[PDB]
Design a protein around this ligand. Structure first.
Ligand SMILES: *OP(=O)(O)OCC(C)(C)[C@@H](O)C(=O)NCCC(=O)NCCS
Ligand SMILES: *OP(=O)(O)OCC(C)(C)[C@@H](O)C(=O)NCCC(=O)NCCS
Lengths: 81, 81
């Protein structure tokens, strides 16, 4: 998919799973440091992304997802084998 | 402690637990993204820091330790109650 639609939905998801304001979400926003996600929020987020984009984010790959950009970069790469 | 001695030892530890070159470690180095630490390397690192500086890094606080600077900033803050 073109990034625009992809970023639109991720933003909508992140704002739904963490209950922060949609417009306070930016490419460089850190999930744990800037958005205040805890252990359980992360699990819920990674799974929300896994269902919307129908991907699988292995625990190895989740270690490298710190920012929204990381989320987008991964989704775009590991959706097409 | 003054940061210099603290940074000296952390560098020595990170280089020991991850087997990367000491000089390739910088303040902004990401543990999982730049240094290639896996799940088990992280556990071993957090515990190595916990024994050298005799602190306790709760799982809540470990979520916010992405870079070497984060490691240093935390150690310096949460060592003096
Ligand atoms: O909050 P907590 O320490 O109980 O749990 C944190 C972890 C990283 C174990 C969970 O959030 C978890 O396993 N989530 C699924 C995979 C990740 O989110 N991994 C991110 C590692 S920073
Ligand atoms: O590599 P893995 O998914 O099996 O485990 C990753 C976690 C984050 C569960 C461990 O590295 C772990 O719990 N380590 C102790 C606390 C942390 O390192 N937390 C960092 C969260 S990114």
């Amino acid at each position: 998919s073109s990034l625009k639609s992809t970023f639109d939905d991720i933003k909508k998801i992140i704002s739904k799973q963490l209950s922060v304001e949609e417009d306070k979400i930016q490419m460089n926003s850190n999930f744990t440091k800037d958005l205040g996600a805890d252990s359980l929020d992360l699990v819920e987020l990674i799974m929300a992304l896994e269902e919307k984009f129908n991907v699988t984010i292995s625990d190895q790959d989740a270690l490298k997802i710190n920012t929204v950009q990381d989320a987008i970069d991964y989704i775009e790469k590991n959706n097409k084998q």
